[model samples]
Target chain A: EAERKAVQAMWARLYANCEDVGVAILVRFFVNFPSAKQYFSQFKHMEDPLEMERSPQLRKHACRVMGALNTVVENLHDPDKVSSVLALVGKAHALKHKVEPVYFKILSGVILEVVAEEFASDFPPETQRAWAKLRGLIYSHVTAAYKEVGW
Target chain B: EAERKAVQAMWARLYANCEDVGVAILVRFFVNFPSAKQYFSQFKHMEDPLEMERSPQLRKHACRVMGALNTVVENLHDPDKVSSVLALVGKAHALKHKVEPVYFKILSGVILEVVAEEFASDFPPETQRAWAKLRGLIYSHVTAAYKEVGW
Candidate 1:
């Protein structure tokens, strides 16, 4: 019930900043963890902050990533669809892209940082706990999917 | 019984010709079903048979495609493995690549023609029947996978 309340509520603030918030989160993740960027071979030229900021490919992928998270946030009440979406991402990441599961946690941490920065004044412990739950959900599904993909 | 007898039998003739046979099948498919070629946006310069013939990307992809069919043929007795391989192909094609299901039938037809020409002298009806079964298996698995992936 309120699981939706906190996440959906906070999400509303960033809905319009989908592209902006997403690009910043990704660029920061890439900056903080250069190795994680290797997963996205198409956007490997993120060595320069200017290139990272100006990358259309990075922008497009961030858009898709945020859309999935938006889908999850919007459907917090829909359990099956949430897992279905996560499983698709998980399997595709592990099976097709061979992404290391550790990156999921690190990326989640980066997301939290970004959200906190965005809601610096009003971001309370309540919303932080809810977002942490969402991250837990993402981690479990992706890590399980790694196992399901047999590695 | 005879199912393995024919496909495995003929496939042996083309095993060493994996890239060659695969590229020919794909090129012929593109020629016959021009629209089907769109599924492979990576190698769209198939207008000229010479370019298609000389395409490294086409050769690499054909190698993978033939390898999958080879795996299917070699493990004809391994039912679960066969279905697993085909299901992966099916889901990836339908859900990921969004390939049209009709293209499966057309590609199957093109493969038959290619095999028939290659085995012109001794390609009797007995072996042809076996290949038909293999094609049926491919078509069934792919089409079913398409349905599994939804419309």
Candidate 2:
């Protein structure tokens, strides 16, 4: 429980600077989950990684993605609200967009890597464990919707 | 139209200071639109305004709101994208939350006040006009969802 609190606290500190930290989170997502960009029409045709990084569309999309995650993280204390919002996100991805579980799995790993780098000195072992648990919790909720429809 | 560009540029500069600018924007929202706090469970029961102001939840929620707004502002050049995103936002608020038009009007006023205070010298008459037009443009997209459902 303390570790969970640590993860939440640490993320709050870093994500507060969305311009830098948020953008970096998405950039890492594309770099690690390269296939994820193909899902975005605005990014599908772009070949150069630098071009993708510099695109205004990337910035806009990054903010939306991170902003949504921030909402989830902030409401971690409220299990009901967290479940409600995550379920909506899950349905949007699985039913509406048909996003594969593999992509989310990869994105989760990349998120951890980015947080480790962004909060190196402060990132402790307990915090890492907390984050892993938090990600696992989010994944279960998001993927639960897929299992329901047999997708 | 040119006024829109001016508004965009000025907002870009101010929003770069995300932490400070975002908090101030929400703080103003609560102060100017007291009923707005009622919508947030976190602050609804809090008696002390200063305690509410300093709450971590407030900081997180403020960032999310401002970050979403930043996406809309950044995509003003792409009318289709802007309309598409704003319409989605409208549906979420109007359909899901049944947010009234009055709240949006109050928010727009508070946003302009924050921008004016943050960028006092740079805020010219034209810039203010541009922001008003921009808000109207956003308002149109959001309210369109209400009309679609015959609400």
Candidate 3:
């Protein structure tokens, strides 16, 4: 959890420094999900890598996720809100679907990839280890009821 | 449309004052719609692959057809509540499916390219395209719709 907070803090700074909001978004998306371009290219057709690297639908989802994530991260200073938001997200995901253990793996992979890519230089071994532990703790509760649901 | 205008006018200066808001959105989406990006890229003198690419997800449908119609561009001057608040509406999309950051970038790109194509070489060609995108058509239709509805 501590590691996740540290990483989230870095992202907050990144968000703050983000100018041309578009570029900030593009780089951040790429940094976090370095393989997003690859994933979309495999799943869709984009005209120019530079222009369509994130793709429209993906951009919509990415922005939406970032917006909410931003809210949660920003409210971290408020322990109540932080716990509330995270709990909401976790419960929402579980209730919305039978989020299986496998889904957690995919989520972790995507998230870790994104974080690593975005803060390639800044992230050290210790930070990565911390993030792994953080993921373990968060993933457990979200999936505690996973097997009950087919998701 | 009358109602649209009434509501839109309220945010005109707000929208106009922050053209970047619109620009950010357009650029945010371009990464999602490859076809739109290709069309605009061609228009922009950028090299585009001549082959057509398929979008794997149903969401891709929005950008493909929408781009051909140039919905993003035409809607700029009179922005609709939906488009203006798309990120918020995305809350719905995310609830349906967990969102990522890439989606926003693609959407943004599509909007920017479409707007650029619209202006071509108009005096304020690129200058106010973002502002135009945010409130132009949305406001106009609103005014017309409200007049009829109220009457």
Candidate 4:
């Protein structure tokens, strides 16, 4: 129970601080764009255990996304890193066309899968609720990033 | 037992036809040209299961190669794909830099790790050996491609 709580807490912290910047914004960016989803479809399928476990290509794709997602998660816990990454995403939002909402959604989906897989062992109802909270916080900010800035 | 036999038979086919082609050849091409093991270093640490499992980046990198590796393996038993993929690698080889033996060595090491991770449950010593034989054959061709093509 303690271990599970710890994992859930990790989720909460990560989600709480997860600004809709950089790749998070890119998720929305790609979602609006749609094409980026093709490259990452491999990862998308991997996030789903039922499909990936059945197909090796899906597993391979999942692994690629997992690697990139891990990079983002590692940075999420650090304010300095998070701010810096968000600043970078801010630049993309400035460009308008380059950073669309669809990318943010797609990338967010990838991050969701990665975190879920990482915490799969202990993803009980409580953990799911914690993750949902994180998702809600992130989704709101990401959607707002473009609109707030008028991109 | 049936699945085990199927995997073994698959190994036999892969070993028989696995050529020094595509990225397999590319890695070898770079290693031999560089003469230093610097590039190989990025791929070396992957042998450690703890290191790999801990660093999501490493696992993802391995999986990307695994995706390519699976492609090679899947085609091993199919003539049309094998010929087509080989043809493509051959074209890529023409445009690339010097072929290195060390690249093949690095690739073999990575392949060993990825296969072990994916099939640890049923990957027996004999099965490992069979895969090794195929990897060796590919490595041999990598050397031959460099020698024959002078690239």
* Best candidate (score: TM-score): 2
Candidate 1: residue A17 Cα off by (Å): 3.0
lDDT of 2 at B112: 81
Give the per-residue lDDT of model 3 (tens digit) for B50-113.
Answer: 2222222222343333332233333334445344444333443344433333444445445445
Q: What TM-score results for chain B when candidate 1 is compared with the true chain B?
A: 0.91
TM-score of chain A of each: 0.92, 0.88, 0.54, 0.43
Off by over 4 Å in 3: A1-5, A14-55, A76-79, A97-101, A144-151, B1-21, B24-151
Q: Candidate 3, residues A74-97: lDDT per residue as tens digits?
A: 554565665555556566666763
Per-residue lDDT tens digits of candidate 2, residues B1-151?
6666787788777775434566767777787667777667677766566676665677677777676677788888888888877778777777776778567767878888878776778777766788878878777877786687667
Q: Measured against the native two-chain assembly using Cα atoms, what DockQ does each of the candidate structures obtain, in the order listed?
A: 0.01, 0.06, 0.03, 0.03
Which 10-residue window of candidate 1 chain B scores lowest in summed lDDT?
B12-21
Which scores greater on DockQ, model 1 or model 2? Answer: 2
Per-residue lDDT of model 2, residues A1-151, tens digit only: 5566788788877875634566666777786667778777787677676677666577666666666677788788788877877788778888877888667666777788888877778777777788888788778887886787568
CAPRI verdict (incorrect, acceptable, medium, high) for model 1: incorrect
Global CA lDDT of candidate 4, please? Answer: 0.46
Tens digit per residue, CA lDDT, model 1, B1-151 = 6569677877877765323577788788877777766666666646887677556566556656777888888888988888989989989988888888877877888888888888878665777778778888888988888887886
TM-score of 2: 0.51
DockQ rank order: 2, 3, 4, 1
For all candidates listed, what's the TM-score of chain B alone? 0.91, 0.88, 0.34, 0.48
State the TM-score, rounded to 2 decimals, of chain A in model 4: 0.43
Model 2 stretches with alpha carbons more than 4 Å out: B1-151
